[PDB]
Amino acid sequence: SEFCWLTGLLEKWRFNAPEGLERLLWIYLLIQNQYLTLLVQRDDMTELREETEKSYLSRFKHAHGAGVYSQVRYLEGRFAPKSDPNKMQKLLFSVLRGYWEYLSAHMSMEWVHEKPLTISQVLDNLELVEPHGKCVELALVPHFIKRKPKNGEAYPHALLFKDLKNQAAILMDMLKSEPRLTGWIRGVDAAANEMHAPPELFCPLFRVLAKSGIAHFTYHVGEDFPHLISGIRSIDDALRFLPLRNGDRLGHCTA
Amino acid sequence: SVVKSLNSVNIKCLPTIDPTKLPRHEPILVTVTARLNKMVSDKLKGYWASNDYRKQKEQWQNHLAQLQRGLHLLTDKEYK
């Protein structure tokens, strides 16, 4: 709607443009560009609850690109775990339903249910597909967040630890209640920054998730170290203390 | 003589044309546009990249093209 609008508008100004209405186009572009820079900087509620399900289908379609054969094969998404189990069962459901809607449009294979209405029926629908070299293969990876250090509680990041253990525990019972989900929730990430939480804090947290069948863990070293030597130590701390098997990945190793 | 008085509100008069003094199978409408395209081209050459010279030119080129896509059928003998 926006793009087709602008093609029509400029076409009538192809030869000349009134000064008055031209300035309106000028300020609108300046307003739009200003907001875009603001949006980028804040990154580095209704925000995600607009429709919460159509976006994921559009996201995968945008990743797929034009043509019968997509441009990206293996893709995993990052999503912060929600505070309530009644919300995680909805956020995860909308992603899988969005992904299944992506698969239904392209692959005209038989589906167990036309409308799944729940996470379980999506798993039944998604169990009938195989990776044939052009469909985006998806394996979700929830990512945690590190908060600012709050004083007290016998160690500086404890409400953080109490917060993450609550979010992690919600993830735990989802996997045991839905054993088929272990094929789509394949990883766990901790991506906020470096100093707001020491890397060694996640060590007991990652280990307990390993015993619950996550099977993969990636860390995201914050690239705002106060000194280059400190940054080297931070990656060293992630290597030594965090439980990382062969084939794991780190994030943003700028140090 | 009438066109002499008109040349001497503004009214533009196109030079007199004669179907007998023309090829037999060339219609009038292609000829009247030929003389009509004569002046408008001449006036555009006079401007020669002055203000809004492109604006009149391109709107004229498209209009000539749209007329051309209707000129083949007028001379076409039958339907195809």
Side-chain angles (χ1 to χ4, degrees), chain A residues 1-44 53-255, chain B:
Chain A
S1 59
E2 210 285 344
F3 169 69
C4 183
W5 159 61
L6 198 54
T7 47
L9 164 57
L10 288 177
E11 188 168 352
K12 293 184 186 294
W13 297 356
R14 167 200 286 260
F15 291 161
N16 64 342
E19 280 275 328
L21 297 97
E22 165 176 301
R23 183 169 326 175
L24 272 299
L25 172 67
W26 204 357
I27 175 174
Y28 166 66
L29 293 184
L30 283 162
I31 292 183
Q32 159 165 343
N33 296 335
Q34 204 194 56
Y35 182 86
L36 264 294
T37 44
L38 182 147
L39 170 65
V40 175
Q41 280 193 2
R42 74 178 279 262
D43 283 341
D44 200 60
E53 208 280 329
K54 299 289 94 176
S55 84
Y56 300 145
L57 160 67
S58 71
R59 166 86 70 175
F60 290 124
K61 279 299 304 209
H62 171 61
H64 183 114
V68 60
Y69 277 46
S70 64
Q71 66 183 357
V72 64
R73 181 180 175 183
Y74 283 108
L75 188 147
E76 70 272 17
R78 298 258 185 283
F79 65 104
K82 283 305 299 148
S83 62
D84 295 330
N86 215 345
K87 297 281 277 293
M88 290 285 326
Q89 70 93 24
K90 191 191 315 306
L91 170 56
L92 183 63
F93 162 77
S94 64
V95 173
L96 300 191
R97 175 61 213 283
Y99 183 68
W100 173 88
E101 195 72 13
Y102 164 94
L103 281 191
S104 52
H106 302 177
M107 293 177 71
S108 87
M109 321 305 98
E110 52 167 38
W111 307 116
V112 176
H113 316 98
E114 283 302 320
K115 166 82 185 168
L117 292 169
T118 197
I119 305 179
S120 181
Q121 292 205 350
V122 176
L123 267 296
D124 312 327
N125 269 358
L126 288 192
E127 206 78 3
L128 273 72
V129 65
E130 81 279 12
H132 57 87
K134 70 99 171 180
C135 279
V136 186
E137 178 143 29
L138 161 68
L140 283 72
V141 173
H143 74 283
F144 296 135
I145 54 163
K146 329 179 175 60
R147 303 281 186 178
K148 66 180 64 62
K150 212 78 71 169
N151 297 328
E153 278 82 14
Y155 60 96
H157 313 91
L159 319 169
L160 179 63
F161 177 73
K162 296 303 134 173
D163 198 356
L164 295 192
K165 181 161 74 178
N166 188 9
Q167 295 181 270
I170 284 170
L171 192 58
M172 311 275 268
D173 73 0
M174 201 95 88
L175 270 186
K176 72 199 58 184
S177 61
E178 288 272 338
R180 299 157 301 156
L181 262 176
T182 187
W184 303 92
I185 306 289
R186 299 285 303 170
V188 162
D189 192 331
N193 216 358
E194 173 154 314
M195 296 77 56
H196 319 321
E200 59 265 43
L201 189 143
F202 292 88
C203 295
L205 194 148
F206 282 171
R207 271 181 300 258
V208 71
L209 275 296
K211 304 207 309 201
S212 283
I214 295 300
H216 277 278
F217 306 98
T218 187
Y219 189 82
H220 180 289
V221 181
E223 292 324 286
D224 50 359
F225 38 79
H227 203 295
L228 184 44
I229 318 169
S230 64
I232 308 183
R233 186 265 302 165
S234 162
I235 294 171
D236 168 73
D237 275 10
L239 279 187
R240 291 168 57 190
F241 305 107
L242 275 187
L244 261 62
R245 285 86 58 85
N246 192 354
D248 267 331
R249 314 197 308 275
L250 294 196
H252 303 193
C253 283
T254 312
Chain B
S1 63
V2 173
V3 303
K4 276 193 176 186
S5 176
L6 266 297
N7 287 120
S8 53
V9 297
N10 194 15
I11 295 90
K12 194 58 178 85
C13 55
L14 193 152
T16 184
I17 63 170
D18 179 18
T20 66
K21 297 178 70 176
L22 268 167
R24 46 198 178 277
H25 290 107
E26 263 183 25
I28 305 300
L29 211 53
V30 300
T31 64
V32 66
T33 54
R35 278 91 163 105
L36 193 150
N37 190 28
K38 182 67 180 294
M39 321 169 176
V40 55
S41 66
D42 195 73
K43 289 187 81 74
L44 266 62
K45 303 290 179 176
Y47 271 100
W48 176 234
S50 167
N51 46 2
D52 63 54
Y53 162 67
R54 185 272 304 278
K55 176 159 67 53
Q56 310 155 318
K57 183 175 85 78
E58 296 285 75
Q59 278 209 339
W60 189 246
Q61 301 279 42
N62 317 330
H63 275 74
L64 293 174
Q66 301 169 12
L67 177 80
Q68 186 86 260
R69 285 302 90 84
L71 272 192
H72 73 85
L73 59 89
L74 188 153
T75 62
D76 190 0
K77 183 178 179 180
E78 300 101 7
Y79 88 106
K80 293 179 179 179

